[PDB]
């Protein structure tokens, strides 16, 4: 299939038309997305098939064809960019300063950008271009607006 590094849409025909359920990153032969996008299901790329290798419902992450590859982290300070890939619309960089998810286990980056569900899995970038996690699991605030964690996995 297409094994080229970069960002992808995740489509199903199981509903009406071709419906974008999410986004993911191909890097070093491995596809990364959020568990709630695929539910662990296998993926088609050309004739090529992509089979799940690692996942965790609680982290809401899943890799295909190999172990999780993305190790870079938000530094707590600098601005970032959501490389947002919405349904039927072109990939598009938003620059933003992340807020914080404060949790009984620790603190995580939060990006307060409001985008459809089918955008879940779009990657978050540092200034060097490295992916520091994925947008699309989070929380609805007082306003009615949406705020996402920066979700990153571990690399062995």
């Amino acid at each position: 299939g297409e094994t080229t590094d970069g960002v992808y849409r995740v489509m199903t025909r199981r509903l009406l038309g071709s419906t974008q359920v999410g986004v993911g990153v191909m890097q070093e032969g491995v596809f990364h997305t959020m568990w709630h996008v695929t539910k662990g299901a296998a993926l088609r790329s050309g004739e090529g098939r992509l089979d799940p290798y690692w996942g965790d419902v609680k982290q809401d992450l899943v890799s295909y064809c190999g172990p999780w590859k993305l190790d870079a982290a938000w530094d707590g300070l600098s601005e970032v960019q959501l490389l947002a890939v919405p349904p039927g619309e072109r990939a598009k960089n938003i620059q933003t300063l992340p807020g914080i998810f404060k949790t009984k286990d620790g603190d995580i980056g939060a990006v307060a950008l409001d985008y459809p569900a089918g955008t879940s899995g779009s990657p978050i970038l540092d200034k060097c271009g490295r992916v520091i996690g994925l947008y699309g699991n989070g929380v609805v605030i007082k306003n009615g607006s949406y705020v996402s964690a920066i979700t990153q996995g571990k690399r062995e």
Binding site: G6, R9, R90, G99
Partner: protein, 39 residues
């Protein structure tokens, strides 16, 4: 059955649109991987 379609390169685009705020929130994470506002 699901399939993937390439959407672009992973690049920082200088003079990208700059917006959204930076809120500090107290949140819980359940076993289902759902976040929720602790207040």
């Amino acid at each position: 059955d699901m399939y993937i379609e390439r959407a672009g390169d992973i690049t920082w685009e200088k003079d990208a649109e700059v917006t959204g705020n930076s809120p500090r929130l107290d949140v819980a994470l359940d076993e289902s991987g759902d976040f929720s506002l602790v207040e």
